[PDB]
Amino acid sequence: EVQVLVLDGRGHLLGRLAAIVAKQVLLGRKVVVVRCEGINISGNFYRNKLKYLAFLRKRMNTNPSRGPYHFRAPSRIFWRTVRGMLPHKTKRGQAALDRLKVFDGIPPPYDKKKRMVVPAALKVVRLKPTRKFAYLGRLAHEVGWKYQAVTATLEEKRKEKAKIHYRKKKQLMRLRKQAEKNVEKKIDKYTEVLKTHGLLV
């Protein structure tokens, strides 16, 4: 679509979310993925950590400063996964890669916005409940990420403000239902039109 598509990374499988995101940004859509530390990877934590440690071992023998760059933040890990699904060495792939923004936690532009979810990439439906999985946040922290603690505190502070906002939202909704009972004699004329046409059962 034309607007920015903000996705919540919590509970999403790394490669299934990355495949959906890569196709979206190739179709000219701006995609923002937040909370990349909540992304899951199928398989137990040890064998996923081994996969990253093998990635750490790949480096240029002659000059490691030229070699593969191993990004430790979960947002940059997810970004590199999307880059593996894009034709990033062409101008089209680079333009698509620029349309993607990834964050650890939820920064202030998007912590006050509604966040989408991709069911075809959620762990609850794509993965059998008896299988094991790893957290991208824990995996990143144990391969070098330094900001697991500070992002944890900032996410808790954000969730406290979100709880306050939600309570006001419930209070306004309760007042909405009370008002809808109060103005009832002068609303049933338009309510029956809605009920006739399938809105508002």
Binding site: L5, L7, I20, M116, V117, V118, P119, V125
Partner: protein, 175 residues
């Protein structure tokens, strides 16, 4: 032999009449095949092993599909078969629940592929019978012999994962 949903065929054939034998015997087989062309081909495959018959030296006098007599009644099917593994030949007895004989044999072909990696050219069905519930030997079949059977559907996986592809609400599993 490939597959699909198998159908049962009653194939009746005989040798061609000769001066030695004016009226040769008629032989009948039950063939589970995707279509009647495969059914006739499999019939010659079996009567060549059993009798000294051939497609060129004989003829098929009848080939008609056998319809299920009780397609609305659940029953248990015992199936005797022989198949070729990678290192030998084995006789197997298997049990399935279905409404049709052909459907149970199709279940057997999928099940031999799933558990034993047996292809349909390896498998050789030699007997299919509708057995009573008290004659069943497989606990997977026998656990459905309960007049008060009752179970929930615990973990309902969302299958409309792309309608919508993006949504605010995370799917519910419990129903």
């Amino acid at each position: 032999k490939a597959s699909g949903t198998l159908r049962e065929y009653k194939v009746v054939g005989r040798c061609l009449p000769t001066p030695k034998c004016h009226t040769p015997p008629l032989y009948r087989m039950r063939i589970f095949a995707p279509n009647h062309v495969v059914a006739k081909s499999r019939f010659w495959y079996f009567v060549s092993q059993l009798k000294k018959m051939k497609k060129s030296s004989g003829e098929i006098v009848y080939c008609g599909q056998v319809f299920e007599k009780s397609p609305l009644r659940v029953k248990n099917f015992g199936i005797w078969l022989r198949y070729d593994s990678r290192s030998g030949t084995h006789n197997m007895y298997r049990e399935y629940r279905d409404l049709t004989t052909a459907g149970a044999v199709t279940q057997c072909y999928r099940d031999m592929g799933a558990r034993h990696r047996a292809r349909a050219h390896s498998i050789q069905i030699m007997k299919v019978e509708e057995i009573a519930a008290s004659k069943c030997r497989r606990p997977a079949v026998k656990q459905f012999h309960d007049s008060k059977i009752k179970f929930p559907l615990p973990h309902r996986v969302l299958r409309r994962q792309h309608k919508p592809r993006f949504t605010t609400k995370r799917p519910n599993t419990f129903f």
